[PDB]
Amino acid sequence: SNCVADYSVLYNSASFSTFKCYGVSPTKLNDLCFTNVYADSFVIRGDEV
Amino acid sequence: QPYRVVVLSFELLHAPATVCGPKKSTNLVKNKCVNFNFNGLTGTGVLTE
Amino acid sequence: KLQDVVNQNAQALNTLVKQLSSNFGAISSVLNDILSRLDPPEAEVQIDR
């Protein structure tokens, strides 16, 4: 919270094997603003993704 | 293979905005019809004080 | 009788206004939030609902 983020930096990174989104389209993020971010992080099997 | 995974889980509550994507703000306009974006609650109208 | 006819119309209009705010199963009832959050290939499904 209480910061700015250029999501297009993430978008333009080819390193991500998927960039799927379910309630916003990943171009529009740079024009939006939010109350909480909630980032969650983990390691799993590739078949589990 | 193992995979690194991240989930970003934005909260769109009716509450003070606290993280934004980068878009540059501009001067306030009074008594003119304008498209407006305060904090992502975007609309169109006459912004009267 | 006259107060009744005025109230029934005022109720019909209050109902019709409140129905704008109903989701009908879309991700929002604020049409401009959908149009700012989503790209047309996704937004057309919400807006159709």
Short mmCIF file of N, CA and C in Angstrom, two decimals:
data_model
loop_
_atom_site.label_atom_id
_atom_site.label_comp_id
_atom_site.label_asym_id
_atom_site.label_seq_id
_atom_site.Cartn_x
_atom_site.Cartn_y
_atom_site.Cartn_z
N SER A 1 0.81 -1.21 0.00
CA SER A 1 0.00 0.00 0.00
C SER A 1 0.85 1.27 0.00
N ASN A 2 0.23 2.39 -0.36
CA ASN A 2 0.77 3.75 -0.30
C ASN A 2 2.02 3.94 -1.17
N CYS A 3 1.87 3.64 -2.46
CA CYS A 3 2.92 3.65 -3.48
C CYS A 3 2.32 3.64 -4.90
N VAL A 4 3.16 3.78 -5.92
CA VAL A 4 2.79 3.71 -7.35
C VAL A 4 3.48 2.53 -8.02
N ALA A 5 2.82 1.84 -8.95
CA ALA A 5 3.43 0.72 -9.68
C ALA A 5 3.17 0.76 -11.18
N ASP A 6 4.22 0.68 -12.00
CA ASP A 6 4.05 0.54 -13.45
C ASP A 6 3.89 -0.94 -13.83
N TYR A 7 2.65 -1.43 -13.84
CA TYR A 7 2.33 -2.80 -14.24
C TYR A 7 2.77 -3.13 -15.67
N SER A 8 2.93 -2.13 -16.55
CA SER A 8 3.42 -2.39 -17.91
C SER A 8 4.86 -2.93 -17.92
N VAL A 9 5.66 -2.64 -16.88
CA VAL A 9 6.99 -3.23 -16.71
C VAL A 9 6.89 -4.74 -16.54
N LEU A 10 5.90 -5.21 -15.77
CA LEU A 10 5.60 -6.63 -15.62
C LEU A 10 5.06 -7.22 -16.93
N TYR A 11 4.11 -6.52 -17.55
CA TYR A 11 3.44 -6.92 -18.79
C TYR A 11 4.43 -7.19 -19.92
N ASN A 12 5.40 -6.29 -20.10
CA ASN A 12 6.41 -6.36 -21.15
C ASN A 12 7.50 -7.41 -20.87
N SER A 13 7.58 -7.96 -19.66
CA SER A 13 8.55 -9.01 -19.33
C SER A 13 8.12 -10.37 -19.89
N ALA A 14 8.83 -10.84 -20.92
CA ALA A 14 8.60 -12.15 -21.54
C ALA A 14 8.92 -13.35 -20.61
N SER A 15 9.56 -13.09 -19.46
CA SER A 15 9.95 -14.13 -18.50
C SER A 15 8.76 -14.90 -17.90
N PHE A 16 7.58 -14.28 -17.83
CA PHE A 16 6.36 -14.89 -17.31
C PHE A 16 5.72 -15.82 -18.34
N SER A 17 5.56 -17.10 -17.99
CA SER A 17 4.96 -18.14 -18.83
C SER A 17 3.44 -18.00 -18.95
N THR A 18 2.80 -17.33 -17.99
CA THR A 18 1.41 -16.87 -18.07
C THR A 18 1.24 -15.56 -17.29
N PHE A 19 0.26 -14.76 -17.70
CA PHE A 19 -0.04 -13.43 -17.18
C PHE A 19 -1.56 -13.23 -17.05
N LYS A 20 -2.26 -14.33 -16.73
CA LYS A 20 -3.73 -14.44 -16.75
C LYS A 20 -4.38 -13.51 -15.73
N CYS A 21 -5.53 -12.93 -16.07
CA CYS A 21 -6.26 -12.01 -15.19
C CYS A 21 -7.77 -12.25 -15.28
N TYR A 22 -8.49 -12.06 -14.18
CA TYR A 22 -9.87 -12.55 -14.05
C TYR A 22 -10.93 -11.48 -13.73
N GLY A 23 -10.53 -10.26 -13.36
CA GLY A 23 -11.47 -9.16 -13.07
C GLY A 23 -11.04 -7.77 -13.56
N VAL A 24 -9.90 -7.70 -14.24
CA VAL A 24 -9.32 -6.53 -14.90
C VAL A 24 -8.52 -7.03 -16.10
N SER A 25 -8.36 -6.23 -17.15
CA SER A 25 -7.52 -6.59 -18.31
C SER A 25 -6.14 -5.95 -18.17
N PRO A 26 -5.04 -6.68 -18.41
CA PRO A 26 -3.72 -6.30 -17.93
C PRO A 26 -3.12 -5.04 -18.57
N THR A 27 -3.69 -4.50 -19.64
CA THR A 27 -3.36 -3.17 -20.16
C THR A 27 -3.92 -2.05 -19.28
N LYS A 28 -5.15 -2.19 -18.77
CA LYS A 28 -5.91 -1.16 -18.05
C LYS A 28 -5.36 -0.86 -16.65
N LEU A 29 -4.53 -1.75 -16.09
CA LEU A 29 -3.98 -1.62 -14.74
C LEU A 29 -3.27 -0.28 -14.50
N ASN A 30 -2.51 0.21 -15.48
CA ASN A 30 -1.80 1.49 -15.39
C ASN A 30 -2.73 2.71 -15.22
N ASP A 31 -4.00 2.59 -15.58
CA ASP A 31 -5.00 3.66 -15.49
C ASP A 31 -5.87 3.55 -14.23
N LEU A 32 -5.81 2.42 -13.53
CA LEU A 32 -6.59 2.11 -12.33
C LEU A 32 -5.88 2.52 -11.03
N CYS A 33 -6.66 2.58 -9.95
CA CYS A 33 -6.17 2.77 -8.60
C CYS A 33 -7.01 1.96 -7.60
N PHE A 34 -6.40 1.51 -6.50
CA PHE A 34 -6.90 0.44 -5.62
C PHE A 34 -6.76 0.76 -4.14
N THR A 35 -7.51 0.04 -3.30
CA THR A 35 -7.49 0.21 -1.84
C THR A 35 -6.41 -0.66 -1.18
N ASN A 36 -6.35 -1.96 -1.49
CA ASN A 36 -5.25 -2.87 -1.14
C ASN A 36 -4.76 -3.62 -2.39
N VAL A 37 -3.49 -4.02 -2.40
CA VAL A 37 -2.93 -4.86 -3.46
C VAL A 37 -3.05 -6.36 -3.18
N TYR A 38 -2.68 -6.81 -1.97
CA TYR A 38 -2.54 -8.23 -1.60
C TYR A 38 -1.79 -9.07 -2.64
N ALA A 39 -0.46 -9.04 -2.59
CA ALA A 39 0.39 -9.97 -3.32
C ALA A 39 0.67 -11.23 -2.48
N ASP A 40 0.41 -12.41 -3.05
CA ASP A 40 0.74 -13.72 -2.45
C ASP A 40 1.76 -14.46 -3.32
N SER A 41 2.72 -15.13 -2.69
CA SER A 41 3.89 -15.71 -3.37
C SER A 41 4.20 -17.14 -2.93
N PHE A 42 4.51 -18.04 -3.88
CA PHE A 42 4.79 -19.45 -3.59
C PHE A 42 5.47 -20.20 -4.74
N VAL A 43 6.03 -21.39 -4.45
CA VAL A 43 6.53 -22.35 -5.45
C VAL A 43 5.68 -23.62 -5.50
N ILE A 44 5.34 -24.05 -6.72
CA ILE A 44 4.52 -25.23 -7.03
C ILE A 44 5.05 -25.99 -8.25
N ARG A 45 4.52 -27.19 -8.51
CA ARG A 45 4.77 -27.95 -9.75
C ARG A 45 4.18 -27.23 -10.96
N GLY A 46 4.86 -27.27 -12.11
CA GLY A 46 4.36 -26.70 -13.37
C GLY A 46 3.00 -27.25 -13.81
N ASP A 47 2.76 -28.54 -13.62
CA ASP A 47 1.45 -29.16 -13.85
C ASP A 47 0.34 -28.63 -12.92
N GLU A 48 0.68 -28.10 -11.75
CA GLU A 48 -0.29 -27.57 -10.80
C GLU A 48 -0.78 -26.16 -11.15
N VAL A 49 -0.12 -25.42 -12.05
CA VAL A 49 -0.39 -23.99 -12.32
C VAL A 49 -1.85 -23.72 -12.71
N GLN B 1 8.80 -29.59 -13.55
CA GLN B 1 9.64 -28.54 -12.97
C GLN B 1 8.92 -27.78 -11.84
N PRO B 2 9.66 -27.20 -10.89
CA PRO B 2 9.11 -26.18 -10.01
C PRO B 2 8.90 -24.87 -10.78
N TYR B 3 7.88 -24.12 -10.36
CA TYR B 3 7.49 -22.81 -10.87
C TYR B 3 7.31 -21.82 -9.72
N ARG B 4 7.87 -20.61 -9.86
CA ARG B 4 7.53 -19.46 -9.02
C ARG B 4 6.20 -18.88 -9.49
N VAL B 5 5.30 -18.65 -8.55
CA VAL B 5 3.95 -18.15 -8.80
C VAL B 5 3.63 -16.99 -7.86
N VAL B 6 2.96 -15.99 -8.41
CA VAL B 6 2.48 -14.80 -7.72
C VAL B 6 1.01 -14.59 -8.04
N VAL B 7 0.22 -14.22 -7.04
CA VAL B 7 -1.17 -13.80 -7.20
C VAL B 7 -1.30 -12.36 -6.74
N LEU B 8 -1.82 -11.47 -7.60
CA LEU B 8 -2.14 -10.10 -7.23
C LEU B 8 -3.65 -9.95 -7.11
N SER B 9 -4.14 -9.52 -5.96
CA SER B 9 -5.54 -9.68 -5.58
C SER B 9 -6.19 -8.35 -5.18
N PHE B 10 -6.28 -7.42 -6.13
CA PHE B 10 -6.71 -6.05 -5.86
C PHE B 10 -8.04 -5.94 -5.12
N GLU B 11 -8.15 -4.99 -4.20
CA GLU B 11 -9.39 -4.70 -3.49
C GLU B 11 -10.03 -3.41 -4.03
N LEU B 12 -11.22 -3.54 -4.61
CA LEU B 12 -11.98 -2.46 -5.25
C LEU B 12 -13.05 -1.87 -4.31
N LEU B 13 -12.78 -1.83 -3.00
CA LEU B 13 -13.70 -1.30 -2.00
C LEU B 13 -14.06 0.19 -2.21
N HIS B 14 -15.25 0.59 -1.76
CA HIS B 14 -15.71 1.99 -1.73
C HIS B 14 -15.05 2.74 -0.56
N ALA B 15 -13.78 3.08 -0.75
CA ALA B 15 -12.83 3.47 0.29
C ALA B 15 -11.67 4.30 -0.30
N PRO B 16 -10.86 4.99 0.53
CA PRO B 16 -9.76 5.82 0.03
C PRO B 16 -8.76 4.99 -0.77
N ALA B 17 -8.48 5.47 -1.98
CA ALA B 17 -7.50 4.84 -2.85
C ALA B 17 -6.09 5.03 -2.30
N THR B 18 -5.27 3.99 -2.40
CA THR B 18 -3.99 3.89 -1.69
C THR B 18 -2.86 3.29 -2.54
N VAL B 19 -3.14 2.67 -3.69
CA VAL B 19 -2.10 2.34 -4.70
C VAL B 19 -2.62 2.62 -6.09
N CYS B 20 -1.89 3.39 -6.90
CA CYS B 20 -2.28 3.68 -8.28
C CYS B 20 -1.24 3.20 -9.29
N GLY B 21 -1.70 2.85 -10.49
CA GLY B 21 -0.84 2.88 -11.66
C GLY B 21 -0.45 4.32 -12.05
N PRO B 22 0.66 4.52 -12.76
CA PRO B 22 1.10 5.85 -13.16
C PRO B 22 0.23 6.40 -14.29
N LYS B 23 -0.59 7.39 -13.96
CA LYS B 23 -1.10 8.36 -14.93
C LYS B 23 -1.00 9.75 -14.31
N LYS B 24 -0.51 10.73 -15.07
CA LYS B 24 -0.21 12.07 -14.55
C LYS B 24 -1.49 12.85 -14.30
N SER B 25 -1.61 13.45 -13.12
CA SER B 25 -2.73 14.34 -12.81
C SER B 25 -2.67 15.64 -13.62
N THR B 26 -3.77 16.38 -13.65
CA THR B 26 -3.86 17.67 -14.36
C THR B 26 -4.66 18.70 -13.57
N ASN B 27 -4.60 19.96 -13.97
CA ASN B 27 -5.29 21.06 -13.30
C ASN B 27 -6.81 20.81 -13.19
N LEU B 28 -7.41 21.25 -12.09
CA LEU B 28 -8.85 21.20 -11.89
C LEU B 28 -9.57 22.22 -12.78
N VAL B 29 -10.70 21.83 -13.37
CA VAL B 29 -11.54 22.69 -14.21
C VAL B 29 -12.92 22.84 -13.59
N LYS B 30 -13.46 24.06 -13.54
CA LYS B 30 -14.76 24.38 -12.93
C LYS B 30 -15.76 24.84 -13.98
N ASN B 31 -17.03 24.50 -13.77
CA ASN B 31 -18.17 24.87 -14.62
C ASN B 31 -18.12 24.40 -16.09
N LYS B 32 -17.07 23.70 -16.54
CA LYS B 32 -17.03 23.05 -17.86
C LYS B 32 -17.41 21.58 -17.75
N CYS B 33 -18.16 21.10 -18.73
CA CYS B 33 -18.33 19.67 -18.95
C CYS B 33 -16.99 19.01 -19.28
N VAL B 34 -16.59 17.99 -18.53
CA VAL B 34 -15.32 17.27 -18.73
C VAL B 34 -15.47 15.79 -18.43
N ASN B 35 -14.67 14.96 -19.08
CA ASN B 35 -14.42 13.60 -18.60
C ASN B 35 -13.52 13.70 -17.38
N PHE B 36 -13.82 12.97 -16.31
CA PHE B 36 -13.03 13.02 -15.09
C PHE B 36 -12.69 11.63 -14.56
N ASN B 37 -11.50 11.51 -13.99
CA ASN B 37 -11.00 10.34 -13.30
C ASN B 37 -10.42 10.80 -11.96
N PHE B 38 -11.23 10.75 -10.91
CA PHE B 38 -10.71 10.82 -9.55
C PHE B 38 -10.54 9.39 -9.06
N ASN B 39 -9.30 8.98 -8.77
CA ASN B 39 -9.01 7.70 -8.12
C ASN B 39 -9.57 6.44 -8.81
N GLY B 40 -9.90 6.51 -10.10
CA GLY B 40 -10.54 5.43 -10.85
C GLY B 40 -12.07 5.39 -10.82
N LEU B 41 -12.77 6.23 -10.04
CA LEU B 41 -14.24 6.34 -10.11
C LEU B 41 -14.69 7.24 -11.27
N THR B 42 -14.22 6.88 -12.47
CA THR B 42 -14.31 7.69 -13.68
C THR B 42 -15.75 8.02 -14.07
N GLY B 43 -15.97 9.22 -14.60
CA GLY B 43 -17.27 9.65 -15.10
C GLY B 43 -17.15 10.85 -16.03
N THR B 44 -18.27 11.51 -16.30
CA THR B 44 -18.30 12.72 -17.12
C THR B 44 -19.28 13.70 -16.52
N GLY B 45 -18.93 14.98 -16.44
CA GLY B 45 -19.81 15.95 -15.80
C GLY B 45 -19.22 17.34 -15.67
N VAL B 46 -20.04 18.25 -15.17
CA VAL B 46 -19.68 19.59 -14.73
C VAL B 46 -19.23 19.50 -13.28
N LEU B 47 -17.92 19.66 -13.06
CA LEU B 47 -17.31 19.72 -11.74
C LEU B 47 -17.50 21.11 -11.13
N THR B 48 -18.60 21.34 -10.42
CA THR B 48 -18.82 22.60 -9.68
C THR B 48 -18.26 22.50 -8.26
N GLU B 49 -17.68 23.57 -7.72
CA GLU B 49 -17.29 23.59 -6.31
C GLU B 49 -18.51 23.83 -5.40
N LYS C 1 -57.03 8.96 -3.20
CA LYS C 1 -56.91 8.47 -4.59
C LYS C 1 -55.83 9.19 -5.40
N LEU C 2 -55.71 10.50 -5.25
CA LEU C 2 -54.73 11.29 -6.01
C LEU C 2 -53.34 11.04 -5.45
N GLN C 3 -53.22 11.03 -4.13
CA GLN C 3 -51.97 10.73 -3.46
C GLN C 3 -51.49 9.31 -3.80
N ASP C 4 -52.40 8.34 -3.85
CA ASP C 4 -52.13 6.98 -4.30
C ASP C 4 -51.56 6.93 -5.72
N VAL C 5 -52.19 7.60 -6.69
CA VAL C 5 -51.68 7.60 -8.07
C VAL C 5 -50.29 8.24 -8.15
N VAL C 6 -50.05 9.33 -7.43
CA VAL C 6 -48.71 9.94 -7.39
C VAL C 6 -47.70 8.99 -6.74
N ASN C 7 -48.03 8.38 -5.60
CA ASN C 7 -47.13 7.44 -4.94
C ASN C 7 -46.81 6.22 -5.80
N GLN C 8 -47.78 5.63 -6.49
CA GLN C 8 -47.50 4.46 -7.32
C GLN C 8 -46.51 4.79 -8.45
N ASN C 9 -46.65 5.96 -9.06
CA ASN C 9 -45.69 6.40 -10.07
C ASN C 9 -44.33 6.71 -9.45
N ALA C 10 -44.29 7.40 -8.31
CA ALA C 10 -43.03 7.66 -7.62
C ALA C 10 -42.33 6.36 -7.20
N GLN C 11 -43.08 5.33 -6.78
CA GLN C 11 -42.52 4.01 -6.48
C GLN C 11 -41.98 3.34 -7.73
N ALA C 12 -42.70 3.43 -8.85
CA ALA C 12 -42.25 2.83 -10.09
C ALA C 12 -40.91 3.45 -10.52
N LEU C 13 -40.80 4.77 -10.45
CA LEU C 13 -39.55 5.47 -10.76
C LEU C 13 -38.45 5.14 -9.75
N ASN C 14 -38.73 5.08 -8.45
CA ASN C 14 -37.73 4.69 -7.45
C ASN C 14 -37.23 3.27 -7.70
N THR C 15 -38.13 2.36 -8.04
CA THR C 15 -37.79 0.98 -8.39
C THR C 15 -36.87 0.98 -9.60
N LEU C 16 -37.29 1.64 -10.67
CA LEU C 16 -36.56 1.66 -11.93
C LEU C 16 -35.16 2.27 -11.77
N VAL C 17 -35.02 3.29 -10.92
CA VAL C 17 -33.71 3.83 -10.55
C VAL C 17 -32.89 2.82 -9.78
N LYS C 18 -33.42 2.21 -8.72
CA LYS C 18 -32.67 1.22 -7.94
C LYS C 18 -32.20 0.05 -8.79
N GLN C 19 -33.01 -0.40 -9.74
CA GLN C 19 -32.63 -1.48 -10.63
C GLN C 19 -31.37 -1.17 -11.46
N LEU C 20 -31.02 0.11 -11.68
CA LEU C 20 -29.74 0.45 -12.32
C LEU C 20 -28.54 -0.05 -11.52
N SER C 21 -28.65 -0.02 -10.19
CA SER C 21 -27.59 -0.39 -9.26
C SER C 21 -27.44 -1.90 -9.05
N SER C 22 -28.32 -2.72 -9.63
CA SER C 22 -28.27 -4.18 -9.46
C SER C 22 -27.27 -4.84 -10.40
N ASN C 23 -26.49 -5.81 -9.90
CA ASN C 23 -25.47 -6.48 -10.72
C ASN C 23 -26.04 -7.28 -11.89
N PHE C 24 -27.22 -7.90 -11.77
CA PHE C 24 -27.71 -8.92 -12.71
C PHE C 24 -26.66 -10.00 -13.06
N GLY C 25 -25.73 -10.28 -12.14
CA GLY C 25 -24.63 -11.22 -12.33
C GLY C 25 -23.38 -10.67 -13.02
N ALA C 26 -23.34 -9.41 -13.45
CA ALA C 26 -22.10 -8.79 -13.92
C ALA C 26 -21.17 -8.45 -12.74
N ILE C 27 -19.88 -8.19 -13.00
CA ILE C 27 -18.90 -7.85 -11.95
C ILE C 27 -19.08 -6.46 -11.33
N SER C 28 -19.94 -5.61 -11.88
CA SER C 28 -20.34 -4.32 -11.32
C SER C 28 -21.67 -3.88 -11.92
N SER C 29 -22.35 -2.94 -11.27
CA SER C 29 -23.51 -2.21 -11.80
C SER C 29 -23.16 -0.79 -12.26
N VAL C 30 -21.94 -0.32 -11.99
CA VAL C 30 -21.43 0.95 -12.49
C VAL C 30 -20.81 0.72 -13.86
N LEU C 31 -21.57 0.99 -14.92
CA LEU C 31 -21.20 0.63 -16.29
C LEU C 31 -19.81 1.15 -16.69
N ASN C 32 -19.48 2.40 -16.33
CA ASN C 32 -18.18 2.99 -16.62
C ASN C 32 -17.00 2.29 -15.93
N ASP C 33 -17.22 1.64 -14.78
CA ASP C 33 -16.15 0.87 -14.13
C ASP C 33 -15.79 -0.36 -14.96
N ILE C 34 -16.78 -0.99 -15.59
CA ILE C 34 -16.54 -2.15 -16.45
C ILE C 34 -15.72 -1.72 -17.66
N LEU C 35 -16.11 -0.60 -18.27
CA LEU C 35 -15.49 -0.05 -19.46
C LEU C 35 -14.07 0.45 -19.20
N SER C 36 -13.77 0.87 -17.98
CA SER C 36 -12.40 1.22 -17.57
C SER C 36 -11.58 0.01 -17.12
N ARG C 37 -12.18 -1.02 -16.51
CA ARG C 37 -11.48 -2.23 -16.02
C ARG C 37 -11.14 -3.26 -17.09
N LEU C 38 -11.94 -3.37 -18.16
CA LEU C 38 -11.87 -4.49 -19.11
C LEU C 38 -11.68 -4.07 -20.58
N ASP C 39 -11.07 -4.96 -21.36
CA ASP C 39 -11.04 -4.91 -22.83
C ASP C 39 -12.34 -5.47 -23.44
N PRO C 40 -12.81 -4.96 -24.59
CA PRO C 40 -14.08 -5.37 -25.19
C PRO C 40 -14.32 -6.88 -25.31
N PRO C 41 -13.36 -7.74 -25.69
CA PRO C 41 -13.59 -9.18 -25.76
C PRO C 41 -14.10 -9.79 -24.45
N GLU C 42 -13.72 -9.20 -23.31
CA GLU C 42 -14.19 -9.58 -21.98
C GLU C 42 -15.40 -8.73 -21.56
N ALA C 43 -15.34 -7.42 -21.77
CA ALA C 43 -16.36 -6.47 -21.33
C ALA C 43 -17.71 -6.72 -22.01
N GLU C 44 -17.73 -7.14 -23.27
CA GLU C 44 -18.96 -7.44 -23.99
C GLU C 44 -19.81 -8.49 -23.29
N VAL C 45 -19.19 -9.43 -22.57
CA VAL C 45 -19.90 -10.46 -21.82
C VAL C 45 -20.60 -9.86 -20.60
N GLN C 46 -19.90 -9.00 -19.87
CA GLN C 46 -20.43 -8.31 -18.70
C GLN C 46 -21.56 -7.37 -19.10
N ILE C 47 -21.31 -6.54 -20.11
CA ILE C 47 -22.24 -5.52 -20.57
C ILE C 47 -23.48 -6.17 -21.19
N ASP C 48 -23.34 -7.30 -21.88
CA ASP C 48 -24.49 -8.07 -22.36
C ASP C 48 -25.40 -8.50 -21.21
N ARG C 49 -24.81 -8.94 -20.09
CA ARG C 49 -25.58 -9.32 -18.90
C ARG C 49 -26.31 -8.12 -18.31
#
